[PDB]
Design a protein around this ligand. Structure first.
Ligand code: NDP
Ligand code: MTX
Length: 162
């Protein structure tokens, strides 16, 4: 199970229910990373997608609303249902795409971090959950420079030590 997120230099991930930046490169990397997999997102991050569901991947939406409707998405209500779905699934990798409340609900079962680090600093209200960095190794790092230098970013892959 992977977590996939983008954060500024201080860890910021969101502002007013939306992204605090607009960084197309990162969105085509998101898609690369989630097409074909089981993609888990919290109800509020799902309602912020411009097309719901996002196509070519299983969107699982985590909601406490018993009645919620999301045509074409897998609507569950606790973490045990996510993993009961993933157990049925097998051959699709599970990727937790946010936001903060869902990262906290899977904080013990993630093995890989797919982090995009922005060089700048943005204003918002939601930060990435604290994680033990010391328990992971950075395996891969690729940097993309943008003409807004706040937007220059690094894609890192981190994998959990034995
Ligand atoms: N920079 C980036 O990589 C990322 C950015 N973001 C940003 O993060 C913010 C969204 O984060 P946050 O506000 O934490 O929202 P979430 O996307 O994590 O959604 C929270 C909703 O999730 C449902 N929920 C939470 N935990 C549970 C549980 N254990 N079981 C079942 N339902 C659960 C509830 O929905 P209900 O209210 O329907 O009960 C709760 O309101 C936005 O600004 C967004 O843009 C989001 C993803 C990635
Ligand atoms: C708000 N949000 C959450 C979002 C944004 N960037 C992230 N970036 C990373 N690295 N990780 C995340 N979990 C992440 N989540 C969104 C908004 C749009 C789409 C979206 O349109 N994406 C298209 C691709 C489109 C583009 O390629 O212009 C997709 O097909 O995946 C994805 C996530």
């Amino acid at each position: 199970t992977a977590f996939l997120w983008a954060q500024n230099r201080n860890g910021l991930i969101g502002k007013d229910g939306h992204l605090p930046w607009h960084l197309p490169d990162d969105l085509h990397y998101f898609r690369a990373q989630t097409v074909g997999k089981i993609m888990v997102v919290g109800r509020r991050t799902y309602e912020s997608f411009p097309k719901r569901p996002l196509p070519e991947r299983t969107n699982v939406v985590l909601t406490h609303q018993e009645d919620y409707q999301a045509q074409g998405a897998v609507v569950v209500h606790d973490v045990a249902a996510v993993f009961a779905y993933a157990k049925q699934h097998l051959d699709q990798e599970l990727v937790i795409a946010g936001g903060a409340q869902i990262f906290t609900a899977f904080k013990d079962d993630v093995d890989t971090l797919l982090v995009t680090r922005l060089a700048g600093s943005f204003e918002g209200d939601t930060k990435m959950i604290p994680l033990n960095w010391d328990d992971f190794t950075k395996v891969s790092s690729r940097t993309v420079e943008d003409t807004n230098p706040a937007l220059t970013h690094t894609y890192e892959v981190w994998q959990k030590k034995a």
